[PDB]
């Protein structure tokens, strides 16, 4: 609710999609080739050769890009699934993904958006760090760090972002010469744990009333 409010107040529309997705929307449309390791059964839950449980809410952003022409300002909260499960990782979790596609969007615009969102979210004028990273769907890309002012009980990685890849737009009929865009992703449980001081991620899916009752 809190993540959505930060953006909906500034013109972002809440977009939803199906949890049972296809290879095109979940991978192909996002510049993830057929031979890419993310597609494997070691990371992705499958029903058959083409149908799966979505690994991210990125397919929702794809379905939006196909349906309409820019401007696009969307936030995509939802349940996502990953085959890699143990402590620190659950087979099901929640993440919010964002997308802004307009005529003159920059990496400076992205930095501004992310830095202000984190400040708004954590209710502090905290330091925000942008480290170069990689994603098939974005270029340039960054891993976003914040200080330990919200503890580990001197930086913490909280989210990722980047400028939408030209091929990602092109594939979804958006001219990369006319339109630029930025996208971002974050894990809801990671954020909740930082916010509320929750140590064990497994408390989120047990539904013990002694846990739940603490958030009244």
């Amino acid at each position: 609710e809190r993540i959505e409010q930060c953006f909906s107040r500034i013109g972002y529309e809440v977009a939803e999609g199906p949890e049972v997705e296809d290879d095109y929307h979940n991978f192909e449309a996002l510049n993830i080739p057929g031979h890419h390791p993310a597609r494997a059964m070691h990371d992705t839950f499958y029903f058959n050769a083409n149908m799966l449980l979505r690994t991210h809410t990125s397919p929702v952003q794809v379905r939006t890009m196909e349906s309409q022409q820019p401007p696009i300002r969307i936030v995509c909260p939802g349940r996502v699934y990953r085959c890699d499960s143990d402590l620190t990782h659950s087979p099901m979790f929640h993440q919010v993904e964002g997308l802004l596609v307009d005529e003159g969007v920059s990496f400076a615009d992205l930095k501004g958006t992310i830095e202000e969102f984190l400040r708004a979210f954590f209710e502090k004028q905290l330091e925000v760090r942008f480290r170069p990273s990689f994603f098939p769907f974005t270029e340039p890309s960054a891993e976003v760090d914040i200080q330990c002012v919200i503890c580990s009980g001197g930086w913490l990685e909280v989210m990722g972002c980047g400028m939408v890849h030209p091929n990602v737009l092109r594939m979804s009929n958006i001219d990369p010469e006319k339109f630029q865009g930025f996208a971002f992703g974050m894990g809801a449980e990671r954020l909740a744990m930082l916010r509320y001081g929750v140590n064990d991620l497994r408390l989120f899916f047990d539904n013990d009333l002694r846990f739940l009752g603490q958030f009244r």
């Binding site: 307009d102 480290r131 930025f182």
Partner: protein, 791 residues
């Protein structure tokens, strides 16, 4: 990718401390995962030489040694089983400070004077080898500080590389980055060509040039494979997490880690008629060096001879073709394998090697020759032998070629949110070894070097600029937007609204796994085939839920077992109905309750929750958008619910959902002793409502009449209330069922329904005659439709 900083600094030295370098690395896109010292701290330890040993005359486990530090001979008593004359060892002199505050002092061990100590790797925190004394190379410099000699003033930096930086999977790659980052000279290893001593070659055929456009081969005759790998190489490999196995593998590994070129050596005797670089035949069998017997596919590139396959190209060598103890002659290989042609191939056989990784990520297409010469020199140095000429087989047509990229300054300024100077742009791009030629005002034609497989577009160039400039040095702006006032329709019950309503109504929000146990699924949905996962995490997480009920009930009993009496939970989420072909993924709002109706309190009745408590909760939700009248609760049946206490909820005949008590048989099966009340609503049928349509307020009094109605115990109350409304005329403003009686005062198969009827005329007062008239028509209608009677 792990490496020795000392070795890196020998190529490109950043002139900043370790801490500064490790910091910057992450800030430029090479995230450091670890930085550790290569050894423990100590002083006063030099290279010593054992001149003679003698048996200690008063202790058999000890030896009396004469050891030189290159300046003086000292008598040291030693108990290590490997101590012998000629041995080069670490000599800790009197005064030397060893790890864990161990100061070497003078000693008289069993009547014999000892002026120092000889050390093991363990004693010095070098390795965990306390088996004996750390035996140093026969040619070690006697007297030199052991930390100096063994390059112990060093760290191992481990980088978590991104798939686009395959070029950084070597010391050559990483040093090129450092040189760019810090604008410092790059001094790569000078690799002099090794001259052929003979003319023996083996022919090489490129039967699949599209998958291997370049292949280099070399004959190395009369190698002594009994010889050891030198310490400098063992240390360099170790500091990169490569364990020493054999001299030949160690060299091919060393060259790969040093330059980035994976190489392979064959036993020349195992090559029949020269090399053939070709695709495998379907079902071709090859035993790897690790013993794995792979059954190959026609899409897989192999290195073969004229008789059979010798290796799976760029991933792993075969057992037969490979070097053994009996090997006297070698055939060295350094080739370029196309990344597209190799992608996923190792994984498809369940394999992953340092070679498969580098080739998949990209190996500099021009590198094979420098690597070949380097490995030739190292092989001759380590195991001797005589080199023949290099056989280079190349396919000019299939060599990788990236068209030059035009970079526009305005596009850099736009993207970065600030302009960069032409000199700065050129300096940065040229440091990365890109070819920058000016193409008019604020435009360049840039060429991509042979080691870079991630650069093909103008945006990749801008990324390089941003990266080396510093992401955190870039400006901050907020995106512009031509925004117009907007809103969703007024008359709608959204899920955030409904959640808060349920909170206010005394519910706790649960979130359960979307995939459940097929056996649990079967209990709630008998006879339905769930949408089952092909690769579930466990077998009890194989079925996609068709109801939020199994998950809610399970969370409810989780709590019951945890000393909870009153459990009131709700969940919202998707249901999965049907198989892929026709699958419906509908959002649901479900709830589950048990225990006392009210929490424990002085002012609260101790009655237990029932159907009508859950009913009020459903009613409150169904009324959230002023459309309660659009819904009807009709007696229905559901396999998970008690058939005597189940309501099917409808809107225009369409199914909204169900409300009822969990079936006692299901409870038995789940070991649930308490009554549980469930509801599940299809959100699509709840969200729409109606906007208020004002109806004028009468200035006149309302008139009420009460009716006590005797009806068959089984006739539904809403059927009667509906008949009453239909027969009450135009002025009825309210109808209330204020009591139900099924006692001794009447027949055991009947019930009394006490109803309150209110009428208000909008333009006048109502008279008693007309109201009694209307009342009698209601009664008459109920006598003919239900054989009703007044009490």
């Amino acid at each position: 990718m792990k490496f020795s900083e000392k070795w890196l600094r020998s190529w490109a030295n950043p002139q900043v401390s370790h801490d500064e370098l490790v910091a910057r690395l992450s800030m430029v896109g090479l995230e450091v995962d670890a930085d550790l010292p290569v050894a423990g701290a100590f002083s006063g330890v030099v290279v010593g030489e054992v001149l003679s040993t003698e048996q200690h005359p008063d202790a058999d486990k000890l030896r009396v040694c004469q050891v030189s530090n290159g300046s003086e001979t000292f008598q040291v008593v030693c108990g290590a089983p490997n101590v012998r004359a000629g041995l080069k060892i670490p000599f800790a002199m009197i005064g030397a400070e060893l790890p864990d505050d161990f100061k070497i002092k003078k000693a008289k061990l069993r009547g014999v004077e000892s002026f120092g100590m000889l050390c093991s790797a363990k004693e010095l925190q070098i390795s965990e080898e306390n088996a004996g004394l750390l035996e140093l190379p026969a040619d070690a410099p006697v007297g030199q500080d052991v930390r100096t000699y063994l390059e112990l003033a060093d760290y191992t930096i481990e980088v978590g590389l991104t798939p686009n930086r395959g070029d950084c999977l070597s010391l050559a790659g990483l040093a090129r980055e450092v040189s760019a980052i810090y604008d410092v000279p790059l001094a790569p290893v000078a690799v002099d060509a090794v001259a052929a001593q003979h003319d023996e070659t083996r022919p090489v055929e490129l039967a699949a040039p599209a998958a291997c456009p370049r292949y280099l081969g070399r004959v190395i005759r009369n190698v002594d494979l009994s010889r050891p790998t030198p310490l400098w190489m063992v240390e360099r490999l170790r500091r990169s997490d490569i364990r020493s196995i054999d001299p030949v593998v160690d060299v091919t590994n060393y060259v790969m880690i040093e330059l980035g070129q994976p190489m392979h050596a064959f036993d020349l005797a195992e090559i029949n008629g020269g090399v053939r670089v070709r695709m495998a035949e379907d079902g071709e069998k090859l035993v790897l060096l690790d013993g794995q017997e792979i059954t190959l596919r026609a899409d897989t590139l192999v290195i073969a001879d004229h008789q059979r396959a010798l290796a799976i190209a760029g991933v792993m060598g075969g057992e037969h073709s490979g070097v053994s103890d009996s090997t006297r002659d070698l055939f060295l290989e350094a080739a370029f394998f196309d990344t597209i042609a190799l992608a996923g191939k190792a994984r498809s056989y369940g394999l992953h090697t340092d070679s498969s990784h580098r080739f998949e990520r990209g190996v500099d297409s021009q590198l094979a020759r420098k690597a070949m010469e380097r490995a030739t020199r190292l092989i001759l140095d380590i195991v001797g032998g005589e080199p023949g000429p290099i056989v280079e087989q190349v396919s000019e047509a299939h060599l990788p070629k990236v068209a030059p990229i035009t970079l526009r300054a305005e596009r850099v300024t736009q993207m970065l949110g600030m302009p960069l100077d032409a000199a700065e742009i050129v300096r940065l791009l040229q440091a990365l070894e890109l070819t920058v030629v000016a193409d008019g005002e604020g435009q360049w034609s840039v060429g991509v070097p042979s080691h870079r497989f991630d650069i093909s577009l103008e945006v990749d160039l801008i990324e390089e600029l941003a990266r080396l400039y510093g992401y955190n040095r870039l400006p901050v702006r907020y995106p512009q937007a031509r925004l117009a006032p907007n809103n969703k329709p007024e008359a709608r019950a959204a899920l955030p609204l409904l959640r808060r309503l349920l909170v206010a109504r005394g519910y706790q929000e649960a979130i359960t796994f979307s995939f459940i146990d097929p056996a649990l699924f079967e209990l709630f949905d008998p006879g339905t085939q769930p949408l089952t996962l092909a690769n579930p995490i466990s077998a009890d997480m194989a079925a996609m839920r068709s109801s939020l009920w199994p998950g809610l009930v399970k969370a409810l009993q989780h709590n019951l077992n945890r000393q909870q009496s009153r459990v009131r939970l709700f969940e919202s989420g998707l249901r999965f109905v049907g198989q892929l072909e026709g699958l419906k993924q509908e959002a649901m709002l479900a709830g589950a309750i048990c225990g006392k109706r009210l929490p424990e309190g002085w002012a609260n009745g101790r009655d237990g929750v029932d159907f009508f408590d859950a009913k009020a909760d459903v009613e409150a939700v169904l009324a959230s958008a002023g459309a309660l009248g659009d819904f009807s609760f009709v007696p229905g049946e559901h396999p998970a619910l008690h058939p005597g206490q189940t309501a099917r909820i409808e809107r225009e005949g369409r199914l909204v959902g169900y409300l009822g008590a969990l079936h006692p048989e299901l409870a038995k099966k789940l070991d649930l002793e308490q009554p549980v009340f469930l509801f599940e609503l299809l959100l699509a049928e709840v969200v729409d409502g109606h906007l208020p349509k004002f109806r004028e307020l009468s200035r006149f009094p309302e008139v009420r009449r009460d009716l006590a109605l005797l009806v068959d115990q089984d006739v539904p109350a809403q059927d009667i209330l509906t008949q009453i409304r239909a027969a009450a005329g135009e002025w009825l403003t309210d109808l209330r069922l204020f009591d139900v009686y099924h006692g001794k005062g009447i027949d055991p198969h009947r019930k009394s329904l006490a109803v309150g009827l209110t009428w208000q005329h909008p333009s006048r007062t109502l008279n008693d005659d007309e109201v009694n008239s209307t009342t009698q028509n209601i009664v008459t209608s109920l006598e003919e439709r239900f054989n009703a009677t007044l009490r």
